[PDB]
């Protein structure tokens, strides 16, 4: 397991605004996080390529820098698809451990 906290732990409806996803380092994580988008009754999918070296294969709307203790990312705007449960995963070492997670 790993010890970190993800914010905003609680999310009110986000309308016409940027949405920010954050988590805190437990293993000195640097560029080691993969963002996730999941719809209930469906398989969860990555919201980004995890940007271990560079972000790729992702709409530019979700962009963030993860290094040190700072693992923050922003979403450009609210969308029906953008109304989606989000999570974080431990990346540098075994076992990968999920962050609390938030839903809209």
């Amino acid at each position: 397991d790993i010890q970190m906290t993800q914010s905003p732990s609680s999310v009110s409806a986000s309308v016409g605004d940027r949405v920010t996803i954050t988590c805190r380092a437990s293993q000195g994580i640097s560029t080691w996080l993969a963002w996730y988008q999941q719809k209930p009754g469906k398989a969860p999918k990555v919201l980004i390529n995890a940007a271990s070296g560079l972000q790729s294969g992702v709409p530019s709307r979700f962009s963030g820098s993860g290094s040190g203790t700072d693992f923050t990312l922003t979403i450009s705007s609210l969308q029906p698809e953008d109304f989606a449960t989000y999570y974080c995963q431990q990346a540098h070492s075994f076992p990968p451990t999920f962050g609390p997670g938030t839903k809209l």
């Binding site: 993969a34 990555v46 390529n49």
Partner: peptide, 10 residues
């Protein structure tokens, strides 16, 4: 991926 990436699920 570059590091531990899983994308295709069931």
């Amino acid at each position: 991926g570059i590091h531990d990436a899983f994308d295709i699920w069931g």
